[PDB]
Specification:
Length: 302
Amino acid sequence: MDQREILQKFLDEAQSKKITKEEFANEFLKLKRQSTKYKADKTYPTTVAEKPKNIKKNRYKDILPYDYSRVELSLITSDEDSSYINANFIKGVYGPKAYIATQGPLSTTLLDFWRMIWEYSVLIIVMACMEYEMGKKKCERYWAEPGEMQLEFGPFSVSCEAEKRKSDYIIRTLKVKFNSETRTIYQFHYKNWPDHDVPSSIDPILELIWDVRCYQEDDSVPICIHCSAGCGRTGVICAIDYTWMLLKDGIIPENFSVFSLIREMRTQRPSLVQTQEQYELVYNAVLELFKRQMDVIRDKHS
């Protein structure tokens, strides 16, 4: 309705902004400061994640899910399964459980990872990194390749029916069997995240998101996103996808702000978007999406 006007102002605001890598640096440091500081002593409790019984379930002791938005596990399998998993729900355009931001599972949380996927009827899983990347092991293998022996985590058995190789990522069609029941989960595994360069990664990442949305158009079930900590690249994708949903729904608000969007997501999952480069990526991706939506508006104009 008023989108053309709103988008245009945002577009003019950018093609008339010094926008230095310094402004980004200052702006991002400022975001980290105001999102984490100036709180009350008891702000953002993370007691469950800090419980003696759950301490070993966290990949990074400094990255703990907030109690209020943590993904609670009620699906019981063995008699040593708690409701805890390092993950938080992130609100989407249509629902409060549009995304699940979680850490890359540990050898001790592989069962919990699948408990979560099953309990919440997740269809799409987006892994934002290769298992082994830049000299580090990002997370434990919770999937299998075609022809490999099925994997078993507690009562769950996982196998891979097919695998589609694309330009910057691959798509695995996983089959998971629980209590005589079998579901299909589509795992998008991004395997070409740019070293130090966002300009070159905008299009491939938008391609990923476009592809994912061909499978799921709304927030009816949670889309699970992760890599290692469940914060950096995880936040880049949630922020970009969320923004795209606003654009497609024609609901971008006036004075839309990437700074504010990230702070808004940081209230649901700590440390969402960890580096300045990742921040710039979200900013640049959003601008490109604003331009693409403008092309859509103009093309449809009768």
